[PDB]
Amino acid sequence: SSLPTTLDPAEYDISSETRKAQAERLAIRSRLKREYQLQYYDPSRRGVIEDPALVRWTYARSANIYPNFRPNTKTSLLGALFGIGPLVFWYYVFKTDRDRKEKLIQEGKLDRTFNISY
Amino acid sequence: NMFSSLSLVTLLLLTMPIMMMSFNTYKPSNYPLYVKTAISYAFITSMIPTMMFIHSGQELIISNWHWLTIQTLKLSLSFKMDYFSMMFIPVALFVTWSIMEFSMWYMYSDPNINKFFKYLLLFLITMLILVTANNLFQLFIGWEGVGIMSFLLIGWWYGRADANTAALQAILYNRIGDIGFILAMAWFLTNLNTWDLQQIFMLNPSDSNMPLIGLALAATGKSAQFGLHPWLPSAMEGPTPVSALLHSSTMVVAGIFLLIRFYPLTENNKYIQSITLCLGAITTLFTAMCALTQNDIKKIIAFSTSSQLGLMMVTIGINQPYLAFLHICTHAFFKAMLFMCSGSIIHSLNDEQDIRKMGGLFKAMPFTTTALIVGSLALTGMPFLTGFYSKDLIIEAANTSYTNAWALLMTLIATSFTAIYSTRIIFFALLGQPRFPTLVNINENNPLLINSIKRLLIGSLFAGYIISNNIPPTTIPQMTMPYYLKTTALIVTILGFILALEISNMTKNLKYHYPSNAFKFSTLLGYFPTIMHRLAPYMNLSMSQKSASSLLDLIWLEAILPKTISLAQMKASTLVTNQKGLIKLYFLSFLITILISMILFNFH
Amino acid sequence: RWQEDPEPEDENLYEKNPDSHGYDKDPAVDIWNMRVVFFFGFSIVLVLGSTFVAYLPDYRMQEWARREAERLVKYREAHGLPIMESNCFDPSKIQLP
Amino acid sequence: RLFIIKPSGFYDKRFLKLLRFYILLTGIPVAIGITLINVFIGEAELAEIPEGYVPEHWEYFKHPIS
Amino acid sequence: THQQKVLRLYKRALRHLESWCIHRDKYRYFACLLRARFDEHKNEKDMVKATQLLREAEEEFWHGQHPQPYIFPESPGGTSYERYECYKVPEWCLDDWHPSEKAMYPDYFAKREQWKKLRRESWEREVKQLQEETPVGGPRTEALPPARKQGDLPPLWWHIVTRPRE
Amino acid sequence: XXXXXXXXXXXXXXXXXXXXXXXXXXXXXXXXXXXXXXXXXXXXXXXXXXXXXXXXXXXXXXXXXXXXXXXXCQEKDVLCMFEAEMQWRRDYKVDQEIVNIIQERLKACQQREGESHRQNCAKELEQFTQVVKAYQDRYXXXXXXXXXXXXXXXXXXXXXXXXXXXXXX
Amino acid sequence: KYIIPTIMLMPLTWLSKNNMIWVNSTAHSLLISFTSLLLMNQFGDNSLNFSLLFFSDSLSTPLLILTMWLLPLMLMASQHHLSKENLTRKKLFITMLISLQLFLIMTFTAMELILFYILFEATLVPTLIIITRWGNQTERLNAGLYFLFYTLAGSLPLLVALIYIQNTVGSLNFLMLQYWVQPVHNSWSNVFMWLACMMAFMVKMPLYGLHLWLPKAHVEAPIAGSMVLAAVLLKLGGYGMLRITLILNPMTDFMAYPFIMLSLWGMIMTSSICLRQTDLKSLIAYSSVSHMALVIVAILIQTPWSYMGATALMIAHGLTSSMLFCLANSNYERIHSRTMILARGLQTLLPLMATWWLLASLTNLALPPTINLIGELFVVMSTFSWSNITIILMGVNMVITALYSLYMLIMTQRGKYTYHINNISPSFTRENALMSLHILPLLLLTLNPKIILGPLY
């Protein structure tokens, strides 16, 4: 989430060393574009091309489970607090509702007159 | 006897194009004309049994087609033909038929012309089921049906991501409102076995939990209210007859229509009576505030649906269900008139969706301009433009009540607020100097447009004179306070129009005005694109990825048994790789095993 | 380098050569398989089969109990005093203590 | 007039023509199914008379197909 | 690209002015007031003050930033028919037309065979022409126009020289 | 018929006193549509009835009575309990549909009165409370999925609670 | 009558010539599926007995008909796949699908706990070979290893449980014999007796914990999107939960109370993950966790309403989720990568399939009553009698079920497909047949599903 004004004409260097770096952005962009352009405008292709940027994108989410998370830090225990935590949370919600219901059946009847269901 | 026989014909006639859709008979280009001719004769077959109702006769029919014997239950195709259900059918069929005539001119010369009418009939049928429904299950088929057919009508064009999200949020914000109706299903079975309309009118205890997160929350999903209403302006991104069908007659009723049917349940419960006005007073103003400042031809009419929707919610709070649907029946003639006549302007001057660049003068266009004059004044409290028979009876009844004064005062500002947005269609888009940006702009009169709107002009001028005069009334409170309540409703619209004429002239007729720099605009959007379109899907998807996926479902919830796999592979080395050769090492361990058996694991 | 593995296969005909086909190899057998015998199981099991799904198998006394209940309602109201339900299975059985 | 950019269409319409052919092919016993109720009589509401128990049919009311 | 930064800010200022004003005569008055602001300061050459004025130009533009901007016609993104009324069937679908159905309108089928033959024969020449124009390793950002265009056919056309329309 | 309660007598008679106009348009259409397709469908129904001629008898519902209850059969035995389990299940299927008839009696109460609804009837609402309460306390409604052995335990649980209350009071 | 026609389907494939094969395997299975609908639909007052216990009867099993319906449907989907492979291996493969269906006929018909269990585990071996061979993706062995690691470690505790019960009380064998049932007195020895009977059907019926068994089997698919229908049959293969909870332990259900709670977060958190994931098959795989979690919530309540909803949901999911895998198969056979972002655009290339996409996606939601609404609505109405707070948790699930269907639609409605040169041909005659033969039985069950949701109905 953005904190101040919407960042588009704000905070930029006035044509300093960043201009050489900005020219490098188009150099790598066109390098990946030209190899895409050569493998597109031929009629004898027939088939969806690979594009390694999207293949590694799927590999980042589906795989990297046990090569990652080998330093099980205190942040993982904080994530575990959001894991087991909510499962134990409802144990003091459903039981309190049940003990409210079950006591109303035996002493001081609260059961419905037209309850043929269940 | 003929009342029951002719009632099912209206259901049969609408299904006949669906039954004869897959090949059947060779009819190209005639199929869109076939839809128009089917509904035209369906209107005639609906007019006759309504004349039977004004005379004498009530009937609740079952088809003897129940697929349940499950635990003391029967769910047949049950059809109620009484008052609220009866009067709506010819009103809905006449409104749709004119939109079908409008669908001849708009969406013309397109490859998806035949596929367009496929969903429009099902959109009518599901509503016709929901209107006639006598079960709560039969009520669900239509109430979900209108909500599911809207996806294939709002998101009809497969263009940008905005209309796709508009079609998404049409169900997303509906399904939050669905929870109440599923709670309505669950409470009814456990407490009153049958859960059909015949049963639930009898044996009615004072229960607050039933329509708390129930019928009132069902009225927030369908027919948007203050709880959930970001999907109101987004629905206009599709074609114009779809918007002419939804928020005028179909989508606008489905929320309140439930509460009108459940009227004896609301009669006794005073907590529900208060919360209907509490979630009905904010709906009249807060949504209507976004009509003036946000400038779009379709959206001004669309934001004013919710203001009139609040008046439908006020009638629930006053405990008058008889006058509740009478407003919605005339609302079908009010806004469906407005959507197609403005939609005629949109299509004429190429492509314009903003009022800013629209300049269709009263002298420039002959027929569409006159339809807007009659239409916009009909929405305001005018003595004989059918608005008096609908809107003015709500305000006068609401003044004599035991309910909240602040809830009444909030609705009274909204009744005077009607004149300002109506003039924002007249003064801004129609009246004055033309602002249409074109080298050559042409707007031609079509034979299909004239015959459609002219027949609606009879329906818009002669609605309250026929419908409200013939329908049986129940307790009229029009007697007390003539200068404080009765005359004040019409005077507020006159004072509102005088305020609108002064505010528009101060902004437009100023030559050199110079706008200010600092502004507080909650009036512009309501900041729902910042908390409900921005933050609400963000929190659901951040909890999806930062937690759950990258912690629980892949790493931690797996870990338990990969722990035993890692332990088995580690303890494998302590037996395989251990003791590399040497008969000495193997025999030395044998001496220990005898010593354990002799002393430690003792057996004499 | 593998010196044996590099031999990729990419051949999706569909329309190119058979013109109208459901599957590759032998067009004469394909019409007899993809359009005939698949559709006979689509016709018999779904249309003539539908007259067995719900259409008249009697099915666990669903319509039988209607004729059974109607004659028992009139019997225990005219002759008897309780309305068809009072005590289940046990009329004056062996007591607990 | 310009040439319209459309999908294949022929493969899609072929399936619908083949589907509605085989439904109609077994749509004849649907028409015969009406005459099995119309021409051939169903069953009367007759009381239990002492004669037997169940000869080929015990309680097959409404329609003789059961 | 400082000259582009002034032009883009001025282009945005004109199209945002129409949302605030109502009538066309008032639009002309405020535009001339904006012309009095920008033309007076662009005349003299500034190194630090020009960038200071451009960063100050963010203000006033941000004070009046969102009254729902008038993007009335078919504009890229925004509102009102951005990429709409589009069936847009590609050339890939135009090759897989079924027999006994592709025979209808034979002029479109006969021409497309000549277009496909023109592309298949010139692709070897386009690969040599496109592959020839290289600074070292990768291109330096931009397309490759034909230099030695004797016969015809630029290096890289089919999607660019074959749009569906609108 | 017989089992259905139904209305006592249907009223309504044509008056036509105020104005002439074009008489009653609904009654004019009632005479028009009676011969248009109502007479044609009645003639087609009579033609189908005449074409029937010979019809099958069909001996209706089978009896099968008593065969000894589960309460009478003491000690667990597979040969004895099997017929007792079938007897209880057949009664439970009937008792489900007994409620459905009285449920439809209350449906008739709502329509055939209309305006009064809650103030009138008095018998159908009372009959509903007499059967459902008996169904709730005896025939499961709290004993989960249907079982014959569980029903005998449920009947004994209600009897022991009633005997403890009667002896104390 | 269902013994030795499926066993007679075995020599049919071997004896038939190389030109035929597929024509014989499908035609001589459709007429076999006709006879199942002809004979098994009949019921008396209670459960019948067809024969002596080799294969027993039906009590609440129209789920047997579904397997007979998928008996030719798997052969329909695997037509483009296994078209370039050896002819001897084609004969080897069809017999392995037949053997799966052979044991599946046995498990639903046999009303035992001992004969049922060993043939319930006899479906594990053919699926193992079907997954680990012809797998299009790498690391398919993890999908094979964890298939028998999660299931067998939970199911082998049935041998120590089931034999223990019959040693104490009579014999489990005939089931209708087993009404000698003594109420469980809730002891610490009876704690693990209940757990061992449940944990075997806590794996195949996916909870929140021990649920990783399912998505790995679907992402590393046996065959593209064709043999996934057999894994849908394994999901509904955990129907023993209907029989164990009813017969073996009716009194002690205090231990069921935490397991409903564990599956309650197996509704929300399993649907949350199914929103961002890239694989189109995984977007069906995680949605199949939530719809089958509904049954686990239902059964443990043990109310008569829940059984009506559960038995409907077993048939509902078996024809809706499997239909969604056929849509995933049609996309994978053209692009050869199941990335949702890459495969984008219907109607421009696939006009007729787009309507079939709707009739399959919207069935995840509660449409006009097909079998899914009838399945879900009875369960939600059953949970209220259990506890009033449930619909607050259940209502969130109703929102994300729309986030299942529409998100699958929108990501395919976006008309672009610029990089795609393939997918030129729209659809084969057998391709659209899969879309019809899955949806039209659901459309026929809209009218009267009395013979679908039937545990004494």
mmCIF file of N, CA and C in Angstrom, chain G residues 217-257:
data_model
loop_
_atom_site.group_PDB
_atom_site.id
_atom_site.type_symbol
_atom_site.label_atom_id
_atom_site.label_comp_id
_atom_site.label_asym_id
_atom_site.label_seq_id
_atom_site.Cartn_x
_atom_site.Cartn_y
_atom_site.Cartn_z
ATOM 1 N N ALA G 217 -1.085 -35.781 -6.365
ATOM 2 C CA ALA G 217 -1.626 -36.782 -7.291
ATOM 3 C C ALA G 217 -2.293 -36.159 -8.525
ATOM 4 N N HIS G 218 -2.730 -34.903 -8.397
ATOM 5 C CA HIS G 218 -3.398 -34.181 -9.487
ATOM 6 C C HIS G 218 -2.457 -33.304 -10.322
ATOM 7 N N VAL G 219 -1.510 -32.630 -9.660
ATOM 8 C CA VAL G 219 -0.486 -31.809 -10.333
ATOM 9 C C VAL G 219 0.456 -32.716 -11.136
ATOM 10 N N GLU G 220 1.019 -33.727 -10.474
ATOM 11 C CA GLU G 220 1.711 -34.815 -11.163
ATOM 12 C C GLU G 220 0.661 -35.856 -11.559
ATOM 13 N N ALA G 221 -0.119 -35.503 -12.582
ATOM 14 C CA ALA G 221 -1.256 -36.295 -13.055
ATOM 15 C C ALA G 221 -0.819 -37.639 -13.643
ATOM 16 N N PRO G 222 -1.632 -38.706 -13.436
ATOM 17 C CA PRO G 222 -1.377 -40.011 -14.061
ATOM 18 C C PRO G 222 -1.270 -39.918 -15.587
ATOM 19 N N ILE G 223 -2.331 -39.428 -16.231
ATOM 20 C CA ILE G 223 -2.337 -39.107 -17.661
ATOM 21 C C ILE G 223 -3.060 -37.771 -17.848
ATOM 22 N N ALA G 224 -2.312 -36.790 -18.365
ATOM 23 C CA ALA G 224 -2.770 -35.420 -18.690
ATOM 24 C C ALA G 224 -3.964 -34.887 -17.873
ATOM 25 N N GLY G 225 -5.172 -35.289 -18.270
ATOM 26 C CA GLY G 225 -6.406 -35.020 -17.533
ATOM 27 C C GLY G 225 -7.458 -36.070 -17.838
ATOM 28 N N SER G 226 -7.016 -37.326 -17.912
ATOM 29 C CA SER G 226 -7.851 -38.442 -18.355
ATOM 30 C C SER G 226 -8.070 -39.496 -17.267
ATOM 31 N N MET G 227 -6.994 -39.863 -16.571
ATOM 32 C CA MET G 227 -7.034 -40.867 -15.499
ATOM 33 C C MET G 227 -7.226 -40.243 -14.115
ATOM 34 N N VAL G 228 -7.489 -38.938 -14.113
ATOM 35 C CA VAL G 228 -7.780 -38.162 -12.906
ATOM 36 C C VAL G 228 -9.188 -38.496 -12.390
ATOM 37 N N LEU G 229 -10.051 -38.965 -13.294
ATOM 38 C CA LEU G 229 -11.419 -39.405 -12.972
ATOM 39 C C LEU G 229 -11.438 -40.620 -12.034
ATOM 40 N N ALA G 230 -10.389 -41.441 -12.112
ATOM 41 C CA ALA G 230 -10.169 -42.562 -11.192
ATOM 42 C C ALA G 230 -9.788 -42.084 -9.788
ATOM 43 N N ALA G 231 -9.074 -40.958 -9.719
ATOM 44 C CA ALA G 231 -8.719 -40.311 -8.450
ATOM 45 C C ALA G 231 -9.910 -39.578 -7.821
ATOM 46 N N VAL G 232 -10.875 -39.192 -8.659
ATOM 47 C CA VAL G 232 -12.175 -38.666 -8.214
ATOM 48 C C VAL G 232 -12.997 -39.804 -7.587
ATOM 49 N N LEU G 233 -12.879 -41.002 -8.165
ATOM 50 C CA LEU G 233 -13.502 -42.219 -7.628
ATOM 51 C C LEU G 233 -12.889 -42.678 -6.300
ATOM 52 N N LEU G 234 -11.609 -42.363 -6.095
ATOM 53 C CA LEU G 234 -10.917 -42.633 -4.830
ATOM 54 C C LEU G 234 -11.351 -41.674 -3.721
ATOM 55 N N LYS G 235 -11.723 -40.449 -4.104
ATOM 56 C CA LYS G 235 -12.278 -39.454 -3.176
ATOM 57 C C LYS G 235 -13.612 -39.928 -2.601
ATOM 58 N N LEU G 236 -14.512 -40.367 -3.482
ATOM 59 C CA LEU G 236 -15.790 -40.972 -3.082
ATOM 60 C C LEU G 236 -15.641 -42.434 -2.625
ATOM 61 N N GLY G 237 -14.431 -42.978 -2.772
ATOM 62 C CA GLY G 237 -14.082 -44.320 -2.293
ATOM 63 C C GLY G 237 -14.037 -44.448 -0.779
ATOM 64 N N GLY G 238 -14.002 -43.305 -0.090
ATOM 65 C CA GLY G 238 -14.084 -43.248 1.369
ATOM 66 C C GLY G 238 -15.516 -43.161 1.869
ATOM 67 N N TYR G 239 -16.363 -44.062 1.366
ATOM 68 C CA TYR G 239 -17.775 -44.137 1.750
ATOM 69 C C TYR G 239 -17.994 -45.050 2.967
ATOM 70 N N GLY G 240 -16.929 -45.733 3.398
ATOM 71 C CA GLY G 240 -16.942 -46.577 4.601
ATOM 72 C C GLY G 240 -17.219 -45.809 5.884
ATOM 73 N N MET G 241 -16.997 -44.494 5.828
ATOM 74 C CA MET G 241 -17.319 -43.547 6.897
ATOM 75 C C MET G 241 -18.825 -43.494 7.193
ATOM 76 N N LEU G 242 -19.640 -43.685 6.152
ATOM 77 C CA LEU G 242 -21.102 -43.804 6.265
ATOM 78 C C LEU G 242 -21.532 -45.052 7.042
ATOM 79 N N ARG G 243 -20.720 -46.108 6.958
ATOM 80 C CA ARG G 243 -21.029 -47.410 7.559
ATOM 81 C C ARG G 243 -20.418 -47.611 8.950
ATOM 82 N N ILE G 244 -19.211 -47.083 9.155
ATOM 83 C CA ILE G 244 -18.481 -47.212 10.429
ATOM 84 C C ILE G 244 -19.126 -46.378 11.547
ATOM 85 N N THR G 245 -19.434 -45.116 11.245
ATOM 86 C CA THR G 245 -20.058 -44.184 12.199
ATOM 87 C C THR G 245 -21.467 -44.640 12.614
ATOM 88 N N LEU G 246 -22.204 -45.215 11.663
ATOM 89 C CA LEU G 246 -23.572 -45.691 11.884
ATOM 90 C C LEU G 246 -23.643 -46.977 12.718
ATOM 91 N N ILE G 247 -22.775 -47.941 12.407
ATOM 92 C CA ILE G 247 -22.851 -49.288 12.991
ATOM 93 C C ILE G 247 -21.890 -49.492 14.172
ATOM 94 N N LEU G 248 -20.595 -49.266 13.946
ATOM 95 C CA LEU G 248 -19.546 -49.629 14.914
ATOM 96 C C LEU G 248 -19.509 -48.788 16.191
ATOM 97 N N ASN G 249 -19.736 -47.480 16.063
ATOM 98 C CA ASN G 249 -19.729 -46.566 17.215
ATOM 99 C C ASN G 249 -20.765 -45.427 17.106
ATOM 100 N N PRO G 250 -22.000 -45.665 17.608
ATOM 101 C CA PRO G 250 -23.035 -44.623 17.602
ATOM 102 C C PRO G 250 -23.097 -43.750 18.866
ATOM 103 N N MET G 251 -22.699 -44.305 20.012
ATOM 104 C CA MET G 251 -22.768 -43.609 21.299
ATOM 105 C C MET G 251 -21.649 -42.576 21.461
ATOM 106 N N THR G 252 -20.400 -43.020 21.312
ATOM 107 C CA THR G 252 -19.236 -42.155 21.511
ATOM 108 C C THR G 252 -18.900 -41.371 20.238
ATOM 109 N N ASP G 253 -19.340 -40.113 20.220
ATOM 110 C CA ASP G 253 -19.021 -39.165 19.152
ATOM 111 C C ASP G 253 -18.526 -37.826 19.720
ATOM 112 N N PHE G 254 -17.964 -37.892 20.928
ATOM 113 C CA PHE G 254 -17.289 -36.763 21.569
ATOM 114 C C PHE G 254 -15.936 -36.500 20.902
ATOM 115 N N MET G 255 -15.333 -37.564 20.367
ATOM 116 C CA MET G 255 -14.069 -37.493 19.625
ATOM 117 C C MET G 255 -14.255 -37.045 18.170
ATOM 118 N N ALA G 256 -15.505 -37.049 17.705
ATOM 119 C CA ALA G 256 -15.872 -36.522 16.389
ATOM 120 C C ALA G 256 -15.863 -34.992 16.375
ATOM 121 N N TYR G 257 -16.147 -34.405 17.540
ATOM 122 C CA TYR G 257 -16.219 -32.952 17.751
ATOM 123 C C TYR G 257 -14.950 -32.147 17.361
#
